[PDB]
Design a protein around this ligand. Structure first.
Ligand SMILES: N[C@@H](CCC(=O)N[C@@H](CS)C(=O)NCC(=O)O)C(=O)O
Length: 221
């Protein structure tokens, strides 16, 4: 059958959570890297990008854009979206909080230098006093290895991805949250996730100066 194909540039950006979810599901996929503004303009002009943006993923005969549309489809297709409407409500609540915090961190490299220190201080406050307490409370309420329904869901994958990024910012932020530490360890030892964390996978590194320079050239900003 059709192997999913991911269109993005060679960076984490807004495509990385899709790489994580597919890899955790054990799904082999291909990447086609946008390398220039001209490559992106070609995808646009040829009609493959509904809103003239990437990420775009070719899957099951669709040319899907919008990261949440992509992720919702992949999660349902591979049984990572709970078992019923009520479990989906819990999953959706959890992953939208993860997305809110993830978006703050995603945009740090494009923060104006005079605002960066204060932006980071606000993110750390929210991590320590709002988001990490909320997810620690979920894990403590039921004591299970997984956030919802006692089985792996996209919520476990998205949260553990975020925990790795929080660790890159400040490895002390998770220190008072032992259940989050334990989730990070367990999920990382799942065979599919372990393979994704090992070298040679589609997992991408933190954006550096040269990668930011490429992004400015490709996306003209
Ligand atoms: N809400 C969209 C945002 C997509 C988006 O902002 N993509 C950027 C790259 S990360 C882009 O293609 N920007 C070019 C532009 O908007 O013209 C999503 O979640 O996919």
């Amino acid at each position: 059958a059709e192997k999913p194909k991911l269109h993005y540039f060679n960076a984490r950006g807004r495509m990385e959570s899709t790489r994580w979810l597919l890899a955790a599901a054990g799904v082999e996929f291909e990447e086609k890297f946008i390398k220039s503004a001209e490559d992106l303009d070609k995808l646009r002009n040829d009609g493959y990008l509904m809103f003239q943006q990437v990420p775009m993923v070719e899957i099951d005969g669709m040319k899907l854009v919008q990261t949440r549309a992509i992720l919702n489809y992949i999660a349902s297709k591979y049984n990572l979206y709970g078992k019923d409407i009520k479990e989906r409500a819990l999953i959706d609540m959890y992953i939208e909080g993860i997305a809110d915090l993830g978006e703050m961190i995603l945009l740090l490299p494009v923060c104006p230098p005079e605002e960066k220190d204060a932006k980071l201080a606000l993110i750390k406050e929210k991590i320590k006093n709002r988001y990490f307490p909320a997810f620690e409370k979920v894990l403590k309420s039921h004591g299970q290895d997984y956030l919802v329904g006692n089985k792996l869901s996209r919520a476990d994958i998205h949260l553990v991805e975020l925990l790795y990024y929080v660790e890159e910012l400040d490895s002390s932020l998770i220190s008072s949250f032992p259940l989050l530490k334990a989730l990070k360890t367990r999920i990382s030892n799942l065979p599919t996730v372990k393979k994704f964390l090992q070298p040679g996978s589609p997992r991408k590194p933190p954006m550096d100066e040269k990668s930011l320079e490429e992004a400015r050239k490709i996306f003209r900003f």
